[PDB]
Amino acid sequence: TAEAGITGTWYNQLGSTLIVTAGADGALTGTYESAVGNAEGSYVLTGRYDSAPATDGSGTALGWTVAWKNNYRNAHSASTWSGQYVGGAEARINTQVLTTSGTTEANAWKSTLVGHDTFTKVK
């Protein structure tokens, strides 16, 4: 469904790679490899998607998180992508992304970045 459409490899506009499996009951699981930031190698990704989307031409809502810790790096931060999958010949996952770093309370006002990421099936 959107299950078949979402499962697989996606590439963002910055050169990052998402490899994700969409489970039949709403789970997203896989890995992320970032082309930017204090990051190297792959990181675990987990999220959710609407496993019964509308059929009226609407996208399929989804989101996921990556905490930026693996065996090679820990940036003490985590990003969440919120967006929708749009299927078909030019499939895309269009997202907004929040990246929060751990901070002191005094620096909490500057703890969270906002950005946007568009993923496509080809590099």
PDB file of all heavy atoms in Angstrom, residues 37-60:
ATOM      1  N   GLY A  37      26.740  17.399   9.130  1.00  0.00           N
ATOM      2  CA  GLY A  37      26.760  17.479  10.591  1.00  0.00           C
ATOM      3  C   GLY A  37      27.787  16.576  11.238  1.00  0.00           C
ATOM      4  O   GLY A  37      28.575  15.926  10.554  1.00  0.00           O
ATOM      5  N   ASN A  38      27.777  16.561  12.569  1.00  0.00           N
ATOM      6  CA  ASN A  38      28.609  15.662  13.357  1.00  0.00           C
ATOM      7  C   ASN A  38      27.988  14.274  13.307  1.00  0.00           C
ATOM      8  O   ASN A  38      27.276  13.866  14.230  1.00  0.00           O
ATOM      9  CB  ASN A  38      28.698  16.152  14.805  1.00  0.00           C
ATOM     10  CG  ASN A  38      29.111  15.059  15.773  1.00  0.00           C
ATOM     11  OD1 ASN A  38      29.319  13.907  15.380  1.00  0.00           O
ATOM     12  ND2 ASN A  38      29.234  15.415  17.053  1.00  0.00           N
ATOM     13  N   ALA A  39      28.259  13.568  12.213  1.00  0.00           N
ATOM     14  CA  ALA A  39      27.614  12.295  11.906  1.00  0.00           C
ATOM     15  C   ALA A  39      28.490  11.503  10.946  1.00  0.00           C
ATOM     16  O   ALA A  39      29.138  12.078  10.058  1.00  0.00           O
ATOM     17  CB  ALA A  39      26.227  12.538  11.296  1.00  0.00           C
ATOM     18  N   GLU A  40      28.558  10.192  11.141  1.00  0.00           N
ATOM     19  CA  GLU A  40      29.296   9.335  10.217  1.00  0.00           C
ATOM     20  C   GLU A  40      28.915   7.890  10.450  1.00  0.00           C
ATOM     21  O   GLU A  40      28.815   7.438  11.593  1.00  0.00           O
ATOM     22  CB  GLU A  40      30.798   9.482  10.399  1.00  0.00           C
ATOM     23  CG  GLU A  40      31.334   8.696  11.560  1.00  0.00           C
ATOM     24  CD  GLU A  40      32.767   9.065  11.887  1.00  0.00           C
ATOM     25  OE1 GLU A  40      33.636   8.912  10.998  1.00  0.00           O
ATOM     26  OE2 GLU A  40      33.019   9.497  13.036  1.00  0.00           O
ATOM     27  N   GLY A  41      28.760   7.164   9.343  1.00  0.00           N
ATOM     28  CA  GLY A  41      28.210   5.843   9.369  1.00  0.00           C
ATOM     29  C   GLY A  41      26.699   5.961   9.475  1.00  0.00           C
ATOM     30  O   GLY A  41      26.097   7.009   9.249  1.00  0.00           O
ATOM     31  N   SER A  42      26.069   4.866   9.805  1.00  0.00           N
ATOM     32  CA  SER A  42      24.654   4.922   9.821  1.00  0.00           C
ATOM     33  C   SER A  42      24.148   4.980  11.245  1.00  0.00           C
ATOM     34  O   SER A  42      24.838   4.646  12.225  1.00  0.00           O
ATOM     35  CB  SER A  42      24.039   3.767   9.021  1.00  0.00           C
ATOM     36  OG  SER A  42      23.998   2.599   9.781  1.00  0.00           O
ATOM     37  N   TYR A  43      22.917   5.455  11.358  1.00  0.00           N
ATOM     38  CA  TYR A  43      22.261   5.611  12.638  1.00  0.00           C
ATOM     39  C   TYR A  43      20.907   4.945  12.583  1.00  0.00           C
ATOM     40  O   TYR A  43      20.248   4.911  11.520  1.00  0.00           O
ATOM     41  CB  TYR A  43      22.033   7.089  12.897  1.00  0.00           C
ATOM     42  CG  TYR A  43      23.308   7.866  13.031  1.00  0.00           C
ATOM     43  CD1 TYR A  43      23.969   8.363  11.901  1.00  0.00           C
ATOM     44  CD2 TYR A  43      23.875   8.113  14.281  1.00  0.00           C
ATOM     45  CE1 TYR A  43      25.167   9.072  12.008  1.00  0.00           C
ATOM     46  CE2 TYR A  43      25.071   8.815  14.399  1.00  0.00           C
ATOM     47  CZ  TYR A  43      25.704   9.309  13.256  1.00  0.00           C
ATOM     48  OH  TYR A  43      26.893   9.996  13.372  1.00  0.00           O
ATOM     49  N   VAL A  44      20.453   4.431  13.718  1.00  0.00           N
ATOM     50  CA  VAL A  44      19.148   3.769  13.770  1.00  0.00           C
ATOM     51  C   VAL A  44      18.031   4.792  13.598  1.00  0.00           C
ATOM     52  O   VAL A  44      18.106   5.894  14.143  1.00  0.00           O
ATOM     53  CB  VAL A  44      18.979   3.020  15.116  1.00  0.00           C
ATOM     54  CG1 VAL A  44      17.547   2.498  15.302  1.00  0.00           C
ATOM     55  CG2 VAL A  44      19.984   1.863  15.211  1.00  0.00           C
ATOM     56  N   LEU A  45      16.997   4.396  12.867  1.00  0.00           N
ATOM     57  CA  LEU A  45      15.820   5.221  12.629  1.00  0.00           C
ATOM     58  C   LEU A  45      14.590   4.440  13.019  1.00  0.00           C
ATOM     59  O   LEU A  45      14.464   3.250  12.713  1.00  0.00           O
ATOM     60  CB  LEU A  45      15.775   5.576  11.143  1.00  0.00           C
ATOM     61  CG  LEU A  45      14.617   6.274  10.424  1.00  0.00           C
ATOM     62  CD1 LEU A  45      15.089   6.923   9.094  1.00  0.00           C
ATOM     63  CD2 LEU A  45      13.453   5.282  10.193  1.00  0.00           C
ATOM     64  N   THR A  46      13.675   5.107  13.713  1.00  0.00           N
ATOM     65  CA  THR A  46      12.391   4.480  14.006  1.00  0.00           C
ATOM     66  C   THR A  46      11.295   5.523  13.879  1.00  0.00           C
ATOM     67  O   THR A  46      11.502   6.717  14.190  1.00  0.00           O
ATOM     68  CB  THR A  46      12.335   3.828  15.402  1.00  0.00           C
ATOM     69  OG1 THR A  46      11.136   3.110  15.525  1.00  0.00           O
ATOM     70  CG2 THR A  46      12.382   4.820  16.525  1.00  0.00           C
ATOM     71  N   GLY A  47      10.127   5.105  13.420  1.00  0.00           N
ATOM     72  CA  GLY A  47       9.013   6.042  13.260  1.00  0.00           C
ATOM     73  C   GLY A  47       7.694   5.342  13.015  1.00  0.00           C
ATOM     74  O   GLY A  47       7.539   4.148  13.293  1.00  0.00           O
ATOM     75  N   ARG A  48       6.739   6.099  12.527  1.00  0.00           N
ATOM     76  CA  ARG A  48       5.385   5.585  12.277  1.00  0.00           C
ATOM     77  C   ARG A  48       4.844   6.211  11.006  1.00  0.00           C
ATOM     78  O   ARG A  48       5.206   7.343  10.631  1.00  0.00           O
ATOM     79  CB  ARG A  48       4.431   5.946  13.426  1.00  0.00           C
ATOM     80  CG  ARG A  48       4.855   5.462  14.843  1.00  0.00           C
ATOM     81  CD  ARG A  48       4.690   3.966  15.048  1.00  0.00           C
ATOM     82  NE  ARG A  48       3.285   3.593  14.901  1.00  0.00           N
ATOM     83  CZ  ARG A  48       2.856   2.359  14.719  1.00  0.00           C
ATOM     84  NH1 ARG A  48       3.711   1.353  14.656  1.00  0.00           N
ATOM     85  NH2 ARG A  48       1.552   2.141  14.578  1.00  0.00           N
ATOM     86  N   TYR A  49       3.897   5.514  10.374  1.00  0.00           N
ATOM     87  CA  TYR A  49       3.175   6.110   9.210  1.00  0.00           C
ATOM     88  C   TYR A  49       1.726   5.659   9.273  1.00  0.00           C
ATOM     89  O   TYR A  49       1.414   4.639   9.932  1.00  0.00           O
ATOM     90  CB  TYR A  49       3.857   5.690   7.907  1.00  0.00           C
ATOM     91  CG  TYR A  49       3.585   4.262   7.495  1.00  0.00           C
ATOM     92  CD1 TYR A  49       2.681   4.000   6.478  1.00  0.00           C
ATOM     93  CD2 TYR A  49       4.196   3.203   8.124  1.00  0.00           C
ATOM     94  CE1 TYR A  49       2.382   2.697   6.084  1.00  0.00           C
ATOM     95  CE2 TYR A  49       3.934   1.897   7.722  1.00  0.00           C
ATOM     96  CZ  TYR A  49       3.011   1.656   6.718  1.00  0.00           C
ATOM     97  OH  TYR A  49       2.719   0.365   6.301  1.00  0.00           O
ATOM     98  N   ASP A  50       0.856   6.393   8.574  1.00  0.00           N
ATOM     99  CA  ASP A  50      -0.552   6.026   8.461  1.00  0.00           C
ATOM    100  C   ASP A  50      -0.637   4.838   7.497  1.00  0.00           C
ATOM    101  O   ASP A  50      -0.425   5.000   6.286  1.00  0.00           O
ATOM    102  CB  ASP A  50      -1.317   7.245   7.917  1.00  0.00           C
ATOM    103  CG  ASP A  50      -2.773   6.941   7.637  1.00  0.00           C
ATOM    104  OD1 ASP A  50      -3.251   5.809   7.977  1.00  0.00           O
ATOM    105  OD2 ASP A  50      -3.403   7.850   7.072  1.00  0.00           O
ATOM    106  N   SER A  51      -0.962   3.651   8.024  1.00  0.00           N
ATOM    107  CA  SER A  51      -1.001   2.432   7.202  1.00  0.00           C
ATOM    108  C   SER A  51      -2.363   2.205   6.542  1.00  0.00           C
ATOM    109  O   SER A  51      -2.594   1.131   5.958  1.00  0.00           O
ATOM    110  CB  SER A  51      -0.611   1.242   8.071  1.00  0.00           C
ATOM    111  OG  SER A  51      -1.420   1.171   9.240  1.00  0.00           O
ATOM    112  N   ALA A  52      -3.252   3.198   6.634  1.00  0.00           N
ATOM    113  CA  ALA A  52      -4.498   3.217   5.843  1.00  0.00           C
ATOM    114  C   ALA A  52      -4.777   4.646   5.337  1.00  0.00           C
ATOM    115  O   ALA A  52      -5.749   5.243   5.753  1.00  0.00           O
ATOM    116  CB  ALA A  52      -5.633   2.781   6.689  1.00  0.00           C
ATOM    117  N   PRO A  53      -3.928   5.197   4.451  1.00  0.00           N
ATOM    118  CA  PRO A  53      -4.076   6.567   3.977  1.00  0.00           C
ATOM    119  C   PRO A  53      -5.349   6.783   3.133  1.00  0.00           C
ATOM    120  O   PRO A  53      -5.994   5.829   2.704  1.00  0.00           O
ATOM    121  CB  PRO A  53      -2.816   6.779   3.107  1.00  0.00           C
ATOM    122  CG  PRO A  53      -2.442   5.415   2.661  1.00  0.00           C
ATOM    123  CD  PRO A  53      -2.783   4.519   3.810  1.00  0.00           C
ATOM    124  N   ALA A  54      -5.693   8.044   2.920  1.00  0.00           N
ATOM    125  CA  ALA A  54      -6.806   8.394   2.054  1.00  0.00           C
ATOM    126  C   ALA A  54      -6.472   7.994   0.635  1.00  0.00           C
ATOM    127  O   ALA A  54      -5.310   7.735   0.284  1.00  0.00           O
ATOM    128  CB  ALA A  54      -7.091   9.890   2.138  1.00  0.00           C
ATOM    129  N   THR A  55      -7.506   7.965  -0.191  1.00  0.00           N
ATOM    130  CA  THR A  55      -7.407   7.438  -1.533  1.00  0.00           C
ATOM    131  C   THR A  55      -7.786   8.542  -2.507  1.00  0.00           C
ATOM    132  O   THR A  55      -7.968   8.297  -3.702  1.00  0.00           O
ATOM    133  CB  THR A  55      -8.363   6.240  -1.699  1.00  0.00           C
ATOM    134  OG1 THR A  55      -9.709   6.674  -1.458  1.00  0.00           O
ATOM    135  CG2 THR A  55      -8.009   5.142  -0.696  1.00  0.00           C
ATOM    136  N   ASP A  56      -7.902   9.756  -1.977  1.00  0.00           N
ATOM    137  CA  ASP A  56      -8.394  10.906  -2.734  1.00  0.00           C
ATOM    138  C   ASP A  56      -7.283  11.726  -3.385  1.00  0.00           C
ATOM    139  O   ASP A  56      -7.510  12.881  -3.784  1.00  0.00           O
ATOM    140  CB  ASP A  56      -9.214  11.815  -1.818  1.00  0.00           C
ATOM    141  CG  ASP A  56      -8.396  12.377  -0.680  1.00  0.00           C
ATOM    142  OD1 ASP A  56      -7.229  11.953  -0.526  1.00  0.00           O
ATOM    143  OD2 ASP A  56      -8.911  13.245   0.062  1.00  0.00           O
ATOM    144  N   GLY A  57      -6.091  11.150  -3.498  1.00  0.00           N
ATOM    145  CA  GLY A  57      -4.945  11.891  -4.043  1.00  0.00           C
ATOM    146  C   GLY A  57      -4.075  12.525  -2.956  1.00  0.00           C
ATOM    147  O   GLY A  57      -3.110  13.218  -3.251  1.00  0.00           O
ATOM    148  N   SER A  58      -4.441  12.327  -1.696  1.00  0.00           N
ATOM    149  CA  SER A  58      -3.660  12.874  -0.597  1.00  0.00           C
ATOM    150  C   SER A  58      -2.424  12.036  -0.326  1.00  0.00           C
ATOM    151  O   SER A  58      -2.378  10.820  -0.568  1.00  0.00           O
ATOM    152  CB  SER A  58      -4.494  12.943   0.683  1.00  0.00           C
ATOM    153  OG  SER A  58      -5.608  13.800   0.508  1.00  0.00           O
ATOM    154  N   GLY A  59      -1.404  12.702   0.182  1.00  0.00           N
ATOM    155  CA  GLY A  59      -0.202  12.030   0.665  1.00  0.00           C
ATOM    156  C   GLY A  59      -0.485  11.211   1.899  1.00  0.00           C
ATOM    157  O   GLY A  59      -1.568  11.315   2.490  1.00  0.00           O
ATOM    158  N   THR A  60       0.515  10.417   2.290  1.00  0.00           N
ATOM    159  CA  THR A  60       0.439   9.515   3.457  1.00  0.00           C
ATOM    160  C   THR A  60       1.313  10.095   4.572  1.00  0.00           C
ATOM    161  O   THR A  60       2.534  10.243   4.388  1.00  0.00           O
ATOM    162  CB  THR A  60       0.999   8.141   3.074  1.00  0.00           C
ATOM    163  OG1 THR A  60       0.188   7.552   2.017  1.00  0.00           O
ATOM    164  CG2 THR A  60       1.021   7.209   4.295  1.00  0.00           C
TER     165      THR A  60
END
